[PDB]
Design a protein around this nucleic acid. Structure first.
Ligand SMILES: [Mg+2]
Ligand SMILES: [Mg+2]
Ligand SMILES: [Mg+2]
Ligand SMILES: [Mg+2]
Ligand SMILES: [Mg+2]
Ligand SMILES: [Mg+2]
Length: 210
DNA sequence: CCCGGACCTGTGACAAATTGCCCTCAGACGG
DNA sequence: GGCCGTCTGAGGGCAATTTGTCACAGGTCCG
């Protein structure tokens, strides 16, 4: 199945995208890499890749596409818009898109890799972000261990403000996304909290492959 | 000493958003 | 040649779940 590769700078960028937008973003990076920034998406293929009907595929593409407007990406810092022209459809079932050509060197560079089947059943976009960050440290055999700082997670993944309260961070982000990864990917993941005084400061992730 | 106060945790409620489903009808194509 | 039946997808919706927010119960240590 398709092997996604991406620069760590994208793995670690600050941005806010939905699941459907992130799904589309994987094919663009795939299209770009197999070679101006102009990409294309076919409704009937998207539906087959992600096990959707044509109707619901059309809905996902149309709404993802119109929600890119105004979205910006920050590399730590430097900000860019993802698109420099609205999307548009020349043919029935076909969409054409214009990625900011200045984003090319950030996609292709110190890199992150995974096959697309690893991520296509994850639902929560923050769990997609976390799984991409763990892959960045994965070893050939399939295991790894990394300590991520809580403030950096909140900035990079652009978590909403109520997750600055640690019990809400635990309940609605960490536990849920560790549970998805363990149920929906081939990775088996555990973690432990690092503290300093009363504040919890980092999360230490260990994982191996099934 | 005990207190009020500034920290921390977890849970019950409720509001806002997202999920996979369902139904309609015209476009593109070929037999 | 040209009409029509089928495969698509572009629309309009839905209720059941999940995600985002905040009040209050309950712990510690400080001055
Ligand atoms: Mg979202
Ligand atoms: Mg959808
Ligand atoms: Mg403190
Ligand atoms: Mg008393
Ligand atoms: Mg009680
Ligand atoms: Mg008290």
């Amino acid at each position: 199945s398709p092997r996604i590769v991406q620069s760590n700078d994208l793995t670690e960028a600050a941005y806010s995208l939905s699941r459907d937008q992130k799904r589309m973003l994987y094919l663009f990076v795939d299209q770009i890499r197999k070679s101006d920034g102009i990409c294309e998406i076919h409704v009937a293929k998207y539906a087959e890749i992600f096990g959707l009907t044509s109707a619901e595929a059309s809905k996902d593409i149309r709404q993802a596409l119109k929600s890119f407007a105004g979205k910006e990406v920050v590399f730590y810092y430097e900000s860019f818009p993802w698109f420099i022209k609205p999307a548009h459809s020349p043919s029935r079932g076909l969409y054409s898109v214009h990625i900011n050509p200045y984003l090319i060197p950030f996609f292709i560079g110190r890199f992150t890799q995974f096959r697309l089947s690893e991520t296509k059943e994850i639902t929560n976009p923050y769990a997609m972000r976390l799984y991409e960050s763990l892959c960045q440290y994965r070893k050939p055999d399939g295991s790894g261990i990394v300590s991520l700082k809580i403030d950096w997670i909140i900035e990079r993944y652009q978590l909403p403000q109520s997750y600055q309260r640690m019990p809400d961070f635990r309940r609605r982000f960490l536990q849920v996304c560790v549970n998805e990864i363990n149920s929906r990917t081939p990775m088996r993941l555990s973690y432990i909290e690092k503290k300093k005084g009363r504040q919890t400061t980092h999360i230490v992730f260990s994982f191996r492959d099934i």
